[PDB]
Amino acid sequence: CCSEDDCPSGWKFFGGSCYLFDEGSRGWEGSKAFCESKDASLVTVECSKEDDFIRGILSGQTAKHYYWIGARWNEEHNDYRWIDGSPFTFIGWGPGKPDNNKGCLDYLNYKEVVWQWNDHVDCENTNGPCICEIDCSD
Amino acid sequence: CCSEDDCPSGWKFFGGSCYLFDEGSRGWEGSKAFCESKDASLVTVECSKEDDFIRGILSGQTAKHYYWIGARWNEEHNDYRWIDGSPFTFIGWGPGKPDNNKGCLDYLNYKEVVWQWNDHVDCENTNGPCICEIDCSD
Ligand SMILES: CC(=O)N[C@@H]1[C@@H](O)[C@@H](O)[C@@H](CO)O[C@H]1O
Ligand SMILES: CC(=O)N[C@@H]1[C@@H](O)[C@@H](O)[C@@H](CO)O[C@H]1O
Ligand SMILES: [Ca+2]
Numbered sequence A, B: 001c002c003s004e005d006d007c008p009s010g011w012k013f014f015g016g017s018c019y020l021f022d023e024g025s026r027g028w029e030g031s032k033a034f035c036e037s038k039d040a041s042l043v044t045v046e047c048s049k050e051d052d053f054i055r056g057i058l059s060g061q062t063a064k065h066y067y068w069i070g071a072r073w074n075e076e077h078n079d080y081r082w083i084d085g086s087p088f089t090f091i092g093w094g095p096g097k098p099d100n101n102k103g104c105l106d107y108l109n110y111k112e113v114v115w116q117w118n119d120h121v122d123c124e125n126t127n128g129p130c131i132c133e134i135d136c137s138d
């Protein structure tokens, strides 16, 4: 429900959402907490246009090769899904993914995974940047 | 997931969605079918900014005093909710609404209901304009 003018300074507008591409260095759980500290949440990716919007941003730098996003293995439902509890619609796994290690998802840029989703086994101690999202739904 | 440039000609952009404010004259069921004919669906209103975007458009004319939207009494769940099966989040009923007549929802402009939701008892034979939505989720 966001418009351009709704995005906080340093956030980017796409597709009714505002996004923060945060260059800090945290674990997945740390990253979830960080986005919450901004009245926001790790990004959820509902469609291929949003997937490609994200890829366009991550592809414009080369320093970092993964960014945490808002999905992880879900014990209750026994699947990977968004942290808001909603199942995947768009499917964005890279070649050969998921490994099914009951881990946490990132966009990964490694070998044949070209800014596509990977499940990483370590939700705690693997430090990287992250992507937060708001949709101004109020 | 829509951007401005994604909206078909005659549709309007707001908040990641494209909207058709169609001035044809159909019943609610007719209106649901019409939006489907456009690879689209009667509008669902997830937030107060989208509610007010819609109000801004409907308020700019005076000929019509109601427009069909994508919600109706749901037999299974025994409530009013969106036709996509999802429950209300934003609550947009006008003063004194719902009547609880197990009907179909419109934006209504009548007496103290000032372009806010009403439940109309007749889902079939009450002819009016409607609001279709796409979110380009592909
Ligand atoms: C943080 C991240 O995604 N790391 C991935 C890892 O999970 C593994 O999939 C590997 C190939 O064995 O590529 C990595 O560098
Ligand atoms: C189409 C529509 O919403 N019509 C509403 C009707 O449902 C009723 O609520 C009435 C007041 O009794 O206002 C009407 O004209
Ligand atoms: Ca999203």
Ligand SMILES: [Ca+2]
Binding pocket: B017, B043, B044, B045, B046, B050, B133
């Ligand atoms: Ca909507």
